[PDB]
Amino acid sequence: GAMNSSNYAELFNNDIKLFVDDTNVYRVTVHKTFEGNVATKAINGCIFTLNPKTGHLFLKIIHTSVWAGQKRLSQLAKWKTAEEVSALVRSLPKEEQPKQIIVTRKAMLDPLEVHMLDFPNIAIRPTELRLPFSAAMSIDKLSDVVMKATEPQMVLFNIYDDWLDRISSYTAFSRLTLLLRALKTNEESAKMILLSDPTITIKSYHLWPSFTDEQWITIESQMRDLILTEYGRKYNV
Template identity: 75%
Template structure:
């Protein structure tokens, strides 16, 4: 859940014509002397807006100001013990950025929402039109709890500040400890290498262009040979951007959905990802499963080679919708010792 989704659901109630998510320069996150809008709302007619006030203020002073454009600027910060008054921060930043010559806002009216990741607090300061303030209060109360992006950002900052020194970290899978794969607990390998795949063509002008094709998530139990094959159809990427990044989150989402669909006794106790970039997305999506250990692998495991098996390659390429398949890679080898048929 995010603010754009909230506004999309309230178009008629707030008389919004269009909700526009602005393209943000990457430097916004650490350039503190100027800012810009993250979301821009266009009115069906014109909104009457109040004088600037805090989100917590109950009495807004309305004057004759009207606008057809209304912006929202989202500011994230990491407060400290001496300075975590988020209301004061929101007010100060709004007044700074709306009066300097460097910040570029699309209209004089808008609101700055400040979120303190360290203390999990939020506030907002700015102009308000009828219905906006109660909506932001309700939306932010839910978003601060449910949006996984906050969790990811908070964890990255904690790691950057080395606030994990007292917490044990799970050792990666290596050639020294691979024996644990064959213990009695259920272990899954999750491979996202083939989730986002493209073909490359040459255009009439001579440029190279890419076109997505069907991909798949491989979820493999090395002890039993069980393979969950989730086909990711190209329709998943329609209208989306940053697809390689999105593929990681899609993988984590599908893994979490599979775990929820299984009885407790069949759920994994440990998940090993073949690419370290999957650690954060899985950690976020598996917050409801604190007993599942998630770790990376130092071994180069060639799961992507499964695509070269004709049976799997054709199945994935010809799929017309997202589907889940269950295979056993060991087939009749179960009479052989576990170590033998894995290697």
């Protein structure tokens, strides 16, 4: 059933699993027409498919051409997500195929279940966790490859950089969710915290800065402070 606070350690066991987040698949800018009506213009999107144990990210870029001449795009976006996840699973060797796929939004359950009928032993699960994966497009290198794409493309990343050399998957996932929660709550402030010291850089092959263990504690503290402040404002408490 549903993935929640109670079964959280399950994410870091040895059963292959993927999170799928469809938030950034169908992206639009809303604008006025010459006649003063409203129209949308689609921009490039992405499916965020993540192995929480290994940090392997399967970033399927959704080029605006896939929406051309289609109707009901927010509905189609769920089915296109389930089509691409199904295609990714079939592309993996049997021993690399997930045993579970956790969708961050319940509207993805039926589309994914129908696309995965050929894989009756892969469990499709919702979650009660409010995961901040929508903020993936606040990671500059992920935003850059999505916006530059001129055709459908899959790009592979490790969203944990080299952190697993020094910390457990549980701790790496907690750090990622904290960074993405900060980026989602106040992007400008989060990005200032991550780059303020120019001597700490991002390796060419990494997404995040090359913090020492001690610098990560300071950073993680700064992100927690950012999130609580913003929360006091949101709610006047």
